[PDB]
Amino acid sequence: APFDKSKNVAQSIDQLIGQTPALYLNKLNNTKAKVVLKMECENPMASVKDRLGFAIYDKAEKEGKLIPGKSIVVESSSGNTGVSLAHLGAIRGYKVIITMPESMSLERRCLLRIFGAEVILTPAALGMKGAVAMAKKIVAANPNAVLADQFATKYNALIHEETTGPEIWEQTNHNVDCFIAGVGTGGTLTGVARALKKMGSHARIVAVEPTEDRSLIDEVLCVAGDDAIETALKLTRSDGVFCGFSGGANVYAALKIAERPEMEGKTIVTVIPSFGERYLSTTLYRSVRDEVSSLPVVDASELQ
Amino acid sequence: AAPFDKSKNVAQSIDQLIGQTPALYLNKLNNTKAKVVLKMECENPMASVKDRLGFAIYDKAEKEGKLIPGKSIVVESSSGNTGVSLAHLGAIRGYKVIITMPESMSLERRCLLRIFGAEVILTPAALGMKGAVAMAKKIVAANPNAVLADQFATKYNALIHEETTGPEIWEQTNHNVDCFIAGVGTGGTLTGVARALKKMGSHARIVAVEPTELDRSLIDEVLCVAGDDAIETALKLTRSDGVFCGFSGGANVYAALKIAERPEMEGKTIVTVIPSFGERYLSTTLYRSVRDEVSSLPVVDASELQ
Ligand SMILES: [Cl-]
Ligand SMILES: [Cl-]
Ligand SMILES: [Cl-]
């Protein structure tokens, strides 16, 4: 059986990665279809990328390609893959180096540095291309250093075929008519689609392309940034799901699909990749920040 | 009970994901001969143990007929994790939630509450908590459908931890708890977990953690933890064990490590609590040492990449 974390004591926090909950969308869903959210936001470092981090360390160690205390893990990511690599690197005793443009927030730097990752900042003008350049440069310069990106490419779809997809299959009672996720790198889409196919599911596979190459994909749905953003704010207030831009896009897509006549009574599954708190000080929740920042204050004369 | 198998079913409400939190052994940071178990309340859906209290408030108050969905207005004079949980769970249940809070409380706290659609009302800094309380009172005095939530926090806090948190620890440790450690001050697991253990016939030592720099028979020992020790421990914990928490968790872990070095604790099991996830505190003084470090980092010159 997968580790029963609700009933036993874990030996390591990596045993808490995956086996995430699944949640019906209720108040926001005014259709005759069912929408299931795979709550990857509930991972220990608050995103789906914990699965990828674990896969990188676990599979690369098993191949003999990462050695704790010798290998230096180098990654040119600001986002959650870098966070997970830093997190799990710390506990497994790897030096982790993250390159990122200087333009990324202090918060993002801070998240990485709390785990003891070495944060290297690159010129704002060169953007992410410059961070990649720096990472490639650090690795060429040290034979013990490895680019983590090669492992992400090798293992990402596999970990989701092995874990996320089977979990969805069991949670939904072997009943999936449509699976929706982002076209991005480092997500569930390919691996979960493969798992569903292999289980004999006839689920329709929908890739979400945000407006702000596989034989597995049945349909690409383009979602405007402003719809993703608006959906994320509605989600918190309707169903208590607090996520990032990707999750809002996915839910928008799911609701659109759910309005189709042929989807009446069917089960649509989508993914909430990351918890929203990481994004509180970003553009996604700017509307809320701007609002509370200029509230009136009750006069002391009214408080007696 | 029929306890919800969330790794294996689809939940009808996010309330069902509250509780049934993991427990984790401290490894690299534990250099003692005792076992230290962390009850990971940071893994609740809104990232703190107070989700259990928010749930208890709505669940129990509704059963008492004191909260009526679609009619009651929930009025809460606090902006901490209990306030967050009330706003979060109120939204999904269809309640308007009002938070009264001093203007001096952090902008980030205001933002998180407003994310859930709470009405955030600010009161003068000079009047502090008492002005927020007076403002809550004023609202409720003018509308009989408005209800002060703090009465319910008082009534149900210890009870929900007796009913859920405590029994979960008991099961997770396979009925083997030699010591339970948690913070003083309301909102805590301490009283309710201690009561659960004692009902189960456990004679675990109960240690209250008191930060510096019933509420009698239940406590065997008080352990004073300096704020600096709590802070340093929180940052060590992230690097050693990958546990990312707030001040309270750092203090608890510091305390647990002190109990673990007691000779009579050799081979014993000590349980403590990680109340909340650390991300909420990244903009606070708890992680200021790290913010100051990363804010002064050098930037690689474009020459090096060309
Ligand atoms: Cl995804
Ligand atoms: Cl997201
Ligand atoms: Cl904490």
XYZ file of C-alpha atoms and ligand atoms in Angstrom:
613
model
C 0.000 0.000 0.000
C 1.119 3.668 -0.371
C 2.283 5.007 3.020
C -0.732 5.590 5.270
C 0.197 9.059 6.525
C -3.113 9.618 8.261
C -2.385 6.578 10.519
C 1.502 6.215 10.843
C 4.564 8.439 11.579
C 6.688 9.322 8.544
C 10.463 8.886 8.565
C 10.982 11.791 6.144
C 8.942 14.692 4.799
C 9.312 13.270 1.267
C 6.877 10.502 2.292
C 4.262 13.261 2.555
C 4.662 14.199 -1.147
C 1.792 13.116 -3.367
C -1.306 11.177 -2.295
C -3.007 14.567 -2.456
C -6.771 15.078 -1.956
C -9.382 15.545 -4.656
C -12.277 17.992 -4.288
C -15.568 18.565 -6.113
C -16.136 22.079 -7.354
C -19.534 23.049 -5.886
C -20.658 26.696 -5.645
C -18.685 27.909 -8.721
C -20.104 25.011 -10.792
C -23.547 25.930 -12.109
C -23.500 23.234 -14.833
C -24.871 19.690 -15.030
C -21.304 18.246 -15.167
C -19.114 17.272 -12.177
C -15.739 18.970 -11.828
C -13.030 17.317 -9.720
C -9.958 19.270 -8.604
C -6.744 17.348 -7.962
C -5.381 19.408 -5.083
C -1.603 19.457 -5.776
C -1.519 22.679 -3.745
C -1.667 20.362 -0.668
C 1.877 18.982 -1.261
C 4.353 19.746 1.588
C 5.981 22.701 -0.201
C 2.607 23.725 -1.660
C 2.872 22.676 -5.303
C 2.779 19.820 -7.789
C 6.530 20.412 -8.321
C 7.280 18.532 -5.080
C 6.569 15.351 -7.111
C 9.131 16.382 -9.752
C 11.721 17.297 -7.115
C 11.306 13.937 -5.432
C 11.428 12.112 -8.804
C 14.678 13.911 -9.738
C 16.469 12.997 -6.509
C 14.978 9.506 -6.203
C 15.396 8.339 -9.810
C 18.754 10.004 -10.477
C 20.203 8.525 -7.255
C 18.895 5.077 -8.280
C 20.610 5.474 -11.684
C 23.861 6.407 -9.894
C 23.819 9.892 -11.432
C 23.358 11.876 -8.169
C 25.517 11.184 -5.112
C 24.573 12.986 -1.836
C 27.509 15.058 -0.587
C 29.316 14.901 -3.968
C 26.823 16.081 -6.620
C 26.015 19.780 -6.774
C 22.512 20.319 -8.131
C 22.239 23.353 -10.431
C 18.923 24.768 -11.589
C 17.961 27.912 -13.518
C 14.399 28.284 -12.210
C 12.772 30.923 -10.046
C 9.484 28.952 -9.699
C 8.331 25.911 -7.768
C 10.744 23.385 -9.356
C 13.655 25.387 -7.901
C 11.840 25.538 -4.527
C 11.348 21.764 -4.428
C 14.920 21.047 -5.517
C 16.184 23.365 -2.770
C 13.871 21.834 -0.179
C 14.620 18.192 -0.889
C 18.282 18.909 -1.610
C 18.733 20.298 1.903
C 17.336 17.235 3.596
C 19.243 14.772 1.350
C 22.543 16.644 1.924
C 23.088 18.143 -1.562
C 24.486 21.576 -2.307
C 21.877 23.282 -4.477
C 22.541 26.304 -6.687
C 19.671 28.287 -8.171
C 20.271 30.940 -10.846
C 17.527 33.543 -11.274
C 17.239 37.076 -12.754
C 17.699 39.902 -10.252
C 14.200 41.069 -11.269
C 12.498 38.164 -9.422
C 10.969 39.138 -6.036
C 12.803 39.122 -2.694
C 10.158 36.612 -1.563
C 11.261 34.140 -4.261
C 14.917 34.593 -3.255
C 13.965 34.190 0.380
C 12.022 30.932 -0.168
C 15.091 29.348 -1.792
C 17.612 30.672 0.707
C 15.649 29.378 3.722
C 16.534 25.877 2.486
C 20.173 26.837 2.241
C 20.312 26.983 -1.553
C 22.950 29.237 -3.030
C 21.029 31.920 -4.924
C 22.930 33.466 -7.846
C 21.350 36.578 -9.422
C 21.656 37.392 -13.139
C 21.042 40.676 -15.080
C 17.384 41.683 -15.384
C 17.950 42.554 -19.054
C 18.935 38.963 -19.897
C 15.790 37.503 -18.194
C 15.516 33.719 -17.775
C 17.827 33.105 -20.745
C 20.606 34.685 -18.662
C 19.897 32.448 -15.648
C 20.120 29.393 -17.944
C 23.438 30.678 -19.314
C 24.789 31.091 -15.792
C 23.624 27.585 -14.779
C 25.196 25.986 -17.888
C 28.356 27.967 -17.039
C 28.497 26.796 -13.380
C 28.077 23.154 -14.496
C 30.737 23.217 -17.248
C 33.066 24.683 -14.591
C 32.552 21.870 -12.045
C 32.551 18.135 -13.010
C 30.594 17.402 -9.791
C 27.801 19.832 -10.777
C 24.761 18.651 -12.765
C 21.987 20.611 -14.503
C 18.726 19.480 -12.883
C 16.828 20.339 -16.075
C 18.046 17.152 -17.820
C 16.450 15.084 -15.048
C 13.220 17.115 -15.122
C 12.920 16.297 -18.833
C 13.675 12.624 -18.284
C 11.360 11.955 -15.284
C 8.475 14.486 -15.270
C 5.913 12.556 -17.325
C 6.955 9.286 -15.673
C 6.360 10.412 -12.075
C 2.844 11.606 -13.023
C 2.073 8.361 -14.889
C 3.268 6.403 -11.821
C 1.610 8.459 -9.046
C -0.725 11.393 -9.826
C -2.633 9.576 -12.557
C -3.259 6.343 -10.612
C -4.347 8.448 -7.592
C -6.900 10.334 -9.737
C -8.122 7.019 -11.182
C -8.768 5.588 -7.706
C -10.199 8.790 -6.222
C -12.729 9.229 -9.047
C -13.894 5.600 -8.803
C -12.474 4.745 -12.264
C -14.735 7.385 -13.776
C -13.093 10.179 -15.802
C -14.708 11.606 -18.954
C -12.348 14.543 -19.361
C -8.920 15.439 -18.000
C -7.674 19.034 -18.271
C -4.242 20.475 -17.473
C -1.728 23.094 -18.626
C 0.525 22.747 -21.687
C 3.411 24.021 -19.544
C 6.628 22.111 -18.824
C 6.767 20.332 -15.445
C 3.024 19.572 -15.134
C 0.733 16.584 -14.903
C -0.732 16.625 -18.442
C 1.352 14.031 -20.318
C 1.881 11.572 -17.465
C -1.736 11.582 -16.277
C -2.970 11.189 -19.894
C -0.703 8.136 -20.304
C -1.919 6.611 -17.053
C -5.581 7.142 -18.000
C -5.073 5.566 -21.457
C -3.247 2.600 -19.939
C -6.115 2.107 -17.436
C -8.549 1.870 -20.394
C -10.119 5.265 -19.684
C -11.730 6.917 -22.674
C -11.321 10.346 -20.989
C -10.978 13.283 -23.379
C -7.555 14.961 -22.823
C -7.571 18.770 -22.941
C -4.443 20.941 -22.880
C -4.890 24.500 -21.536
C -2.897 27.212 -23.299
C -2.925 30.567 -21.413
C -3.102 33.850 -23.411
C -1.004 35.881 -20.908
C 2.863 18.517 -29.577
C 1.411 15.146 -28.495
C -0.853 12.433 -29.895
C -2.382 12.081 -26.414
C -4.079 15.503 -26.624
C -7.644 15.631 -27.944
C -8.135 19.408 -27.762
C -6.248 22.608 -26.902
C -8.252 25.313 -25.156
C -6.854 28.829 -25.113
C -7.634 30.724 -21.908
C -7.156 34.486 -21.561
C -4.965 35.653 -18.673
C -7.748 37.892 -17.364
C -10.124 34.928 -17.190
C -7.525 32.845 -15.278
C -6.951 35.770 -12.878
C -10.687 36.411 -12.361
C -11.349 32.676 -11.828
C -8.664 32.406 -9.114
C -10.352 35.226 -7.105
C -13.806 33.669 -7.555
C -12.539 30.230 -6.507
C -11.357 31.430 -3.117
C -14.717 33.023 -2.317
C -16.973 30.282 -3.806
C -15.248 27.013 -2.866
C -12.322 28.024 -0.609
C -9.715 26.896 -3.135
C -6.727 29.287 -3.058
C -4.371 28.831 -5.994
C -2.164 30.411 -8.620
C -2.617 31.532 -12.182
C -2.419 27.992 -13.622
C -5.173 26.657 -11.406
C -7.451 29.561 -12.287
C -6.872 28.875 -16.012
C -7.559 25.151 -15.527
C -10.785 25.806 -13.638
C -11.959 28.332 -16.264
C -11.327 25.661 -18.938
C -13.111 23.034 -16.898
C -16.225 25.191 -16.423
C -16.315 25.965 -20.163
C -16.082 22.253 -21.006
C -18.698 21.536 -18.297
C -21.248 23.750 -20.140
C -21.188 21.451 -23.191
C -24.445 19.442 -23.632
C -22.487 16.237 -24.186
C -20.856 16.729 -20.756
C -24.147 16.552 -18.825
C -23.671 14.100 -15.943
C -19.980 13.479 -16.879
C -16.900 13.848 -14.641
C -14.301 16.409 -15.615
C -10.973 16.306 -13.731
C -8.480 19.149 -13.551
C -5.487 20.102 -11.427
C -4.791 22.841 -8.891
C -0.985 22.939 -9.281
C 0.004 25.334 -6.478
C -1.256 27.039 -3.329
C -2.183 30.711 -3.738
C -0.307 32.178 -0.755
C 2.999 32.179 -2.726
C 1.274 34.645 -5.119
C -0.339 37.021 -2.613
C 2.156 39.799 -3.450
C 2.081 39.237 -7.244
C -0.165 40.662 -9.998
C -2.576 37.745 -9.605
C -3.936 39.207 -6.305
C -2.984 42.874 -6.849
C -6.666 43.824 -7.046
C -7.163 42.592 -3.472
C -3.938 44.124 -2.164
C -4.739 47.524 -3.696
C -8.185 47.438 -2.108
C -7.185 46.666 1.508
C -4.281 49.125 1.308
C -6.592 52.152 1.260
C -9.406 51.151 3.622
C -10.816 53.827 5.958
C -10.185 53.636 9.693
C -13.008 53.900 12.227
C -12.705 57.083 14.297
C -11.844 56.614 18.013
C -14.925 58.767 18.813
C -17.184 55.909 17.607
C -15.660 53.303 19.933
C -17.237 53.967 23.374
C -16.954 8.522 12.703
C -16.542 6.960 9.231
C -13.284 9.011 8.869
C -12.874 10.374 5.359
C -10.281 8.567 3.218
C -9.002 11.616 1.330
C -6.093 9.903 -0.381
C -8.764 7.541 -1.858
C -12.120 9.452 -2.442
C -13.307 12.862 -3.795
C -14.258 15.371 -1.080
C -17.615 17.183 -1.254
C -16.192 20.183 0.660
C -12.717 21.473 1.555
C -13.806 21.104 5.237
C -13.336 17.374 4.778
C -9.607 17.973 4.177
C -9.202 19.619 7.596
C -7.436 17.491 10.183
C -6.093 13.956 9.669
C -2.708 15.648 9.374
C 0.585 13.717 9.015
C 3.038 13.029 11.762
C 6.764 13.134 11.062
C 9.862 12.046 12.972
C 12.530 14.712 13.426
C 15.705 13.222 11.886
C 18.808 15.343 11.174
C 18.028 17.943 13.880
C 17.471 15.238 16.513
C 20.883 14.261 17.851
C 19.409 12.667 21.000
C 18.471 9.200 22.144
C 14.725 10.085 22.196
C 12.232 9.985 19.313
C 10.599 13.309 18.474
C 7.324 13.259 16.541
C 5.993 16.414 14.848
C 2.239 16.660 14.411
C 2.146 18.538 11.111
C -0.768 20.965 11.503
C 0.968 23.182 8.905
C -0.529 20.674 6.367
C -4.155 21.735 6.957
C -5.862 23.278 3.891
C -5.325 26.875 5.015
C -1.904 26.014 6.444
C -2.554 26.108 10.188
C -4.005 24.168 13.130
C -6.692 26.922 13.433
C -8.541 25.359 10.475
C -9.726 22.793 13.031
C -11.124 25.617 15.183
C -12.791 27.386 12.238
C -14.460 24.094 11.325
C -15.531 23.447 14.942
C -17.036 26.947 15.214
C -19.237 26.577 12.125
C -20.067 22.892 12.704
C -20.909 23.099 16.403
C -22.521 26.557 16.410
C -24.818 25.526 13.529
C -25.859 22.383 15.457
C -26.646 24.616 18.457
C -28.806 26.851 16.196
C -26.521 29.851 16.948
C -25.273 30.212 13.357
C -27.805 30.065 10.530
C -26.313 29.749 7.003
C -27.536 32.563 4.730
C -28.689 34.685 7.725
C -25.996 35.040 10.413
C -23.143 37.524 9.941
C -19.951 36.254 11.518
C -18.095 38.983 13.413
C -14.533 38.212 14.433
C -12.216 40.621 16.264
C -8.918 38.951 15.321
C -6.772 38.868 12.161
C -4.642 35.786 13.019
C -5.036 32.218 11.775
C -8.408 31.796 13.495
C -9.686 34.858 11.608
C -8.320 33.405 8.340
C -10.058 30.069 8.975
C -13.363 31.817 9.833
C -13.184 33.914 6.638
C -12.155 30.908 4.528
C -14.854 28.544 5.829
C -17.503 31.275 6.092
C -17.160 32.034 2.377
C -17.831 28.456 1.349
C -20.816 28.160 3.748
C -22.383 31.405 2.433
C -21.828 33.565 5.522
C -20.758 37.154 5.412
C -17.698 37.486 7.621
C -16.556 40.746 9.200
C -13.059 41.088 10.649
C -12.333 43.987 12.952
C -8.619 44.655 13.298
C -6.266 47.513 14.259
C -4.894 49.516 11.338
C -1.420 48.640 12.674
C -1.797 44.910 11.878
C 0.112 43.858 8.757
C -1.138 44.634 5.275
C -0.485 40.968 4.415
C -3.000 39.852 7.086
C -5.582 42.259 5.641
C -4.967 40.885 2.144
C -5.342 37.222 3.088
C -8.635 37.847 4.880
C -9.997 39.871 1.960
C -8.983 37.088 -0.478
C -11.858 35.103 1.108
C -14.295 37.978 0.701
C -14.356 39.022 4.377
C -15.274 42.609 5.133
C -12.128 43.991 6.786
C -12.830 46.923 9.144
C -9.867 48.831 10.568
C -9.796 50.376 14.047
C -7.353 53.010 15.406
C -3.848 51.835 16.212
C -3.957 53.675 19.534
C -6.903 51.581 20.783
C -5.305 48.241 19.807
C -7.238 44.991 20.287
C -9.783 46.689 22.591
C -10.900 49.018 19.779
C -11.381 46.037 17.424
C -13.462 44.332 20.129
C -15.532 47.520 20.682
C -16.168 47.806 16.947
C -17.326 44.129 16.756
C -19.677 44.785 19.723
C -21.161 47.841 17.989
C -21.984 45.806 14.856
C -23.676 43.051 16.831
C -25.586 45.550 19.021
C -27.208 46.996 15.856
C -28.151 43.680 14.181
C -29.412 40.574 16.045
C -28.365 38.420 13.056
C -24.695 39.417 13.596
C -22.852 37.027 15.934
C -19.550 37.413 17.806
C -17.329 34.482 16.816
C -14.889 34.814 19.719
C -17.435 33.305 22.138
C -17.322 30.123 20.032
C -13.501 30.044 19.822
C -13.496 30.058 23.624
C -16.168 27.391 23.973
C -14.876 24.897 21.376
C -11.078 25.237 21.084
C -10.018 22.679 23.699
C -12.931 20.407 22.730
C -12.038 20.017 19.042
C -8.428 19.031 19.912
C -9.772 16.534 22.451
C -12.039 15.092 19.760
C -9.682 15.037 16.747
C -6.044 16.139 17.117
C -5.389 14.175 20.311
C -6.943 10.883 19.090
C -5.023 11.211 15.793
C -1.702 11.498 17.658
C -2.697 8.518 19.817
C -3.370 6.397 16.728
C -0.336 7.617 14.733
C 2.090 6.830 17.561
C 0.408 3.405 18.125
C -0.559 4.402 21.731
C 3.031 5.260 22.650
C 3.356 8.842 23.929
C 5.783 9.547 26.787
C 5.647 13.322 26.490
C 3.462 15.900 24.737
C 4.718 19.428 24.267
C 2.903 22.485 23.018
C 2.549 26.260 23.524
C 0.630 28.201 26.166
C -2.058 30.664 25.217
C -5.465 30.163 23.672
C -5.787 28.681 20.196
C -3.442 25.896 21.320
C -3.712 22.127 21.075
C -2.223 21.822 24.594
C -5.342 21.509 26.827
C -7.404 19.409 24.453
C -4.630 17.009 23.458
C -3.623 16.573 27.118
C -7.276 15.780 27.998
C -7.510 13.283 25.124
C -4.328 11.531 26.284
C -5.487 11.390 29.929
C -8.908 10.002 28.909
C -7.076 7.263 26.994
C -5.192 6.439 30.208
C -1.852 7.881 29.053
C 0.428 9.180 31.758
C 2.513 11.143 29.255
C 4.342 14.116 30.657
C 2.691 17.315 29.517
C 5.044 20.218 28.865
C 3.803 23.781 28.258
C 6.065 25.982 26.125
C 6.191 29.609 27.231
C 7.921 32.016 24.796
C 9.931 34.855 26.365
C 12.011 37.681 24.809
C -7.027 22.317 33.458
C -4.453 25.147 33.197
C -3.039 23.538 36.369
C -3.221 19.753 36.844
C -2.731 19.288 33.101
C 0.811 20.764 33.007
C 3.735 18.780 34.458
C 6.445 21.240 33.413
C 6.770 24.705 31.919
C 9.669 25.264 29.558
C 10.628 28.847 28.846
C 11.958 29.411 25.323
C 13.679 32.638 24.328
C 12.339 34.180 21.117
C 15.841 34.075 19.592
C 16.004 30.321 20.206
C 12.562 29.839 18.595
C 13.618 31.886 15.573
C 16.993 30.122 15.127
C 15.326 26.724 15.484
C 12.740 27.542 12.768
C 15.550 28.308 10.308
C 17.591 25.230 11.322
C 14.524 23.015 10.930
C 13.990 24.013 7.281
C 17.619 23.187 6.404
C 17.848 19.984 8.471
C 14.443 18.322 8.033
C 12.584 20.415 5.414
C 9.929 21.532 7.891
C 8.953 25.149 7.242
C 6.973 26.707 10.097
C 6.358 29.812 12.184
C 7.603 31.062 15.558
C 5.418 28.715 17.612
C 6.708 25.627 15.794
C 10.295 26.723 16.291
C 9.686 27.205 20.011
C 8.002 23.802 20.293
C 10.864 22.032 18.469
C 13.427 23.840 20.666
C 11.496 22.674 23.752
C 11.163 19.110 22.425
C 14.920 18.903 21.799
C 15.533 20.030 25.420
C 13.171 17.344 26.764
C 14.794 14.791 24.415
C 18.175 15.353 26.131
C 16.704 14.494 29.551
C 18.348 11.164 30.569
C 15.023 9.548 31.472
C 13.739 10.236 27.908
C 16.229 7.795 26.360
C 14.276 5.614 23.922
C 11.012 7.447 24.681
C 8.590 9.141 22.289
C 8.059 12.925 22.565
C 5.262 14.483 20.476
C 5.008 18.153 19.625
C 3.058 20.309 17.182
C 3.986 22.366 14.143
C 0.993 24.778 14.245
C 1.449 26.589 10.906
C 3.327 26.658 7.654
C 6.156 29.176 7.406
C 5.213 30.887 4.117
C 2.688 33.200 5.808
C 5.588 34.630 7.850
C 8.119 35.266 5.106
C 7.378 39.008 5.221
C 7.706 39.122 9.050
C 10.648 39.469 11.459
C 10.797 35.679 11.881
C 12.690 35.395 8.556
C 14.209 38.930 8.478
C 17.743 37.492 8.772
C 17.125 35.667 5.468
C 15.443 38.662 3.781
C 18.426 40.882 4.708
C 20.832 38.303 3.310
C 19.073 37.900 -0.043
C 18.333 41.623 -0.421
C 22.119 42.416 -0.563
C 23.150 39.636 -3.010
C 25.485 40.661 -5.877
C 24.322 40.406 -9.506
C 26.497 38.652 -12.086
C 27.827 41.059 -14.715
C 26.569 40.553 -18.266
C 30.294 40.315 -19.270
C 30.539 36.922 -17.497
C 27.685 35.408 -19.526
C 29.112 36.879 -22.734
Cl -0.314 20.431 -13.699
Cl -1.750 27.195 -9.577
Cl 4.148 27.718 13.723
